[PDB]
Amino acid sequence: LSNKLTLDKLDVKGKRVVMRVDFNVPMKNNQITNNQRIKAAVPSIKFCLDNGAKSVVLMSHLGRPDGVPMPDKYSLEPVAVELKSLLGKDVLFLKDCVGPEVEKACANPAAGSVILLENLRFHVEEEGKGKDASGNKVKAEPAKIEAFRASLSKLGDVYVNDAFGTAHRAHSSMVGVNLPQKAGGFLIKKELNYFAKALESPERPFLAILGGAKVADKIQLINNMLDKVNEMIIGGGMAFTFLKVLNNMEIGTSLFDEEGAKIVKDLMSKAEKNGVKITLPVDFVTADKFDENAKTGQATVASGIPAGWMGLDCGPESSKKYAEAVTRAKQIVWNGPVGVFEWEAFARGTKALMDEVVKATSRGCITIIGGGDTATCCAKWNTEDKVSHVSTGGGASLELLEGKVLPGVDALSNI
Ligand SMILES: Nc1ncnc2c1ncn2[C@@H]1O[C@H](COP(=O)(O)OP(=O)(O)O)[C@@H](O)[C@H]1O
Ligand SMILES: [Mg+2]
Secondary structure (H helix, E strand, C coil): CCCECEHHHCCCCCCEEEEECCCCCCECCCCECCCHHHHHHHHHHHHHHHCCCCEEEEECCCCCCCCCCCHHHHCCHHHHHHHHHHHCCCCEECCCCCCHHHHHHHHCCCCCEEEECCCHHHCHHHHCEEECCCCCEEECCHHHHHHHHHHHHCCCCEEEECCHHHCCCCCHHHHCCCCCCEEECHHHHHHHHHHHHHHHCCCCCEEEEECCCCHHHHHCCHHHHCCCCCEEEECHHHHHHHHHHHHCCCCCCCCCCCCHHHHHHHHHHHHHHCCCEEECCCEEEEECCCCCCCCEEEEECCCCCCCCCEEEEECHHHHHHHHHHHHHCCEEEEECCCCCCCCHHHCHHHHHHHHHHHHHHHCCCEEEEECCCHHHHHHHCCCCCCCCEEECCCHHHHHHHHCCCCHHHHCCCEC
C-alpha cells in the first residue's frame, strides 16, 4: 500500500464515491448473525461523508448465487437496514447494481446520500462465471463483462476499495472499475499493515489452523503456506479429503474435494521435507443428515464414519491434539471453524479450540483469527478482544500468508 493511493489522500469534496466493500456477512434466515464486516467499513464511509462526498455508493457480494438473481436467498436488503443503524443515517437500497435505473438513482444524489446496491453476484459478469438457473456451469461473455464494469464505473466519480475480505478475488467490482482515481480504504490499510508486521518474521513456532468448508479453494493454498509455517492443523471440512487419501478412512457423506485429493500426498511430502508438523483430527461428532436437529454420533478414524452420516465436528482426542499444537505455538493464524459451530451439537470443538487460543494470547502468543465465519466464532463467544487480531479476511488472509499480493490492492492507482 505504501505505493498506492489511499482514501486519506483522495479529495472527495463534492464527488460521488463508488466503494467496493465486503458486506458478505453471515446469515440465518435473512438475519445477520455478525455485523463485524459492516462496522469495519464505517470509518471509510464516514470519512467520505465527513469530508463532503456528494454520495457513497456501496457495493458487495453476498454468498454464492452463481450469477443468477436470488433475492429470496441472497439479498443485501437486510444489510442496508443494519447499515442504517450503524451509521445513524438512512440508506437507500437498490434492487440491482447495474443498468439504467441504477445509473439514474446514482447520477446526481442529494448531498450526503448513502446508497447500497443489490448483490453483485446476481450478475454473472462480476465473477466472470457461475451457473444458469438450472445448475449448469456457465462462463460470462467479455463484451458483457466490459459493460458490467462500465455501468459500475458510472455510479461514482472516484472509486474506493475497502473490501479486504474479498481482496483476493480479481472480480469486476474489485479490479475492473474504470475511474481515474482508485483508492484503498482504511480497512484495507489497517489489515495490510497488521499482516505486514506479523508476517515479516513470525514468532516461532508459527501454527496455521485451517478448517472451514471451502475445501476446493483452501486446499490449493496449502502448498505455498508450507514454506511459511512450522505446524498446521488441518481440521473442519478440510480433514476428510486428507483422511480419505491418507488413511483410506471411510468418510460417509462428509465434505470431499475430488481435485484436492490428487495433491494430498504431495502436500504431506512437502510438509515432511519442510519439517511442518501436520495435525489431523482423530475423532468426530457425526450427524445423520446436514441439519442442526440431526441425530448425533461418535466416530474415529479407525471406525470410519457410517454410510449416510457426515463428520460435522472433531471429537475429544482431536481437541486435545489441537490444544497441544496451540500450546506449542508463539504465533497462530486461524481460518476455518473446526466444526459446524453455528449449530450447537457441532460447536464444542471450535469452542474448545477458541478457549485454548485465548489462553495462548494470555501467555503472549500472537493470535490472529480471520474470516467472515471464523470471526463470527469470536463474536459468538465474546473473544474479539481476547486474541491479538480478528481480521475480516479469511481466504484473503491465507493468500497474504502464502506471500501473495491481493488483486483488489494491486488494482489501485499508484501514488
Ligand atoms: N466438518 C464440516 N463440514 C461442513 N462444514 C464445516 C465443517 N467444519 C466447519 N464447517 C463450516 O465451515 C464454514 C466456514 O468456512 P469458511 O467460509 O471457509 O471460513 P471463513 O468464512 O472463516 O473463511 C462454517 O460455516 C462451518 O459451519
Ligand atoms: Mg466463510
